[PDB]
């Protein structure tokens, strides 16, 4: 239960592609209450990304199957129940992250880049909840996502260079929120195009540490733009 040991085990779990183990280690690190280093922060994010990603992918498959089996009630009821079980896992994972975010990560964020990272993450995990939200709760979930993204967005435009990978990654995910959650293609495109164009005009401000991350995100911004406007 030592911190450096937990971090090393997390790295080992990542190599082994055992992301449940990875998330458990990094959760334990976070719960010790100290602000996460950049490396620790990224390990936590990678771990939960894979843990929730597996559920998101499974959910899409099963929800799709559920829809296409109308009039075969026994098979559909079976598909529905399985979707709901996956959904419960998914919600528990998102609530796990969102709780760590409220209790430790966002309050301990001393610098702007860290505050943007965590607010972005809060935006993401509410967005994943919104993907599977139905009825009453959806509008509330959607507003929680939007508000976290919006605050991150404003802070990033004030404190970070246009080519900063965290600022670009936020624009990318916030544009996806507009496209997929708010059904506003036009606002999604505007946001993506601006982020891309402002980064393009300043490639000299890239560093050796971030030029690969930043240029990959730019490429994805443009990939999305192309798809959305076809």
């Amino acid at each position: 239960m030592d911190k450096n040991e937990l971090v090393q085990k997390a790295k080992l779990a990542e190599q082994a592609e055992r992301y449940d183990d990875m998330a458990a280690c990094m959760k334990s690190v976070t719960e010790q209450g100290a602000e996460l280093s950049n490396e620790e922060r990224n390990l936590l994010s990678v771990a939960y990304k894979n843990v929730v990603g597996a559920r998101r992918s499974s959910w899409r498959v099963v929800s799709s199957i559920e829809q296409k089996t109308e009039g075969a009630e026994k098979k559909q009821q079976m598909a529905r129940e399985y979707r709901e079980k996956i959904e419960t896992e998914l919600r528990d994972i998102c609530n796990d992250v969102l709780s760590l975010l409220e209790k430790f990560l966002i309050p301990n964020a001393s610098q702007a880049e860290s505050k943007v990272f965590y607010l972005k993450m809060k935006g993401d995990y509410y967005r994943y909840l919104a993907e599977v939200a139905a009825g009453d709760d959806k509008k509330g979930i959607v507003d929680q996502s939007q508000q976290a993204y919006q605050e991150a967005f404003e802070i990033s435009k004030k404190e970070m260079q246009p080519t900063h990978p965290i600022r670009l990654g936020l624009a990318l995910n916030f544009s996806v929120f507009y496209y997929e959650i708010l059904n506003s293609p036009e606002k999604a495109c505007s946001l993506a195009k601006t982020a891309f164009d402002e980064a393009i005009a300043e490639l000299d401000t890239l560093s050796e540490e971030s030029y690969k991350d930043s240029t990959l995100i730019m490429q994805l911004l443009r990939d999305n733009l192309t798809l959305w406007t076809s």
């Binding site: 990678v46 993401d124 996806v176 994805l220 990939d223 999305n224 798809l227």
Partner: peptide, 8 residues
Amino acid sequence: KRTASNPK
């Protein structure tokens, strides 16, 4: 081809 979000 599908919508992509931030990879890491």
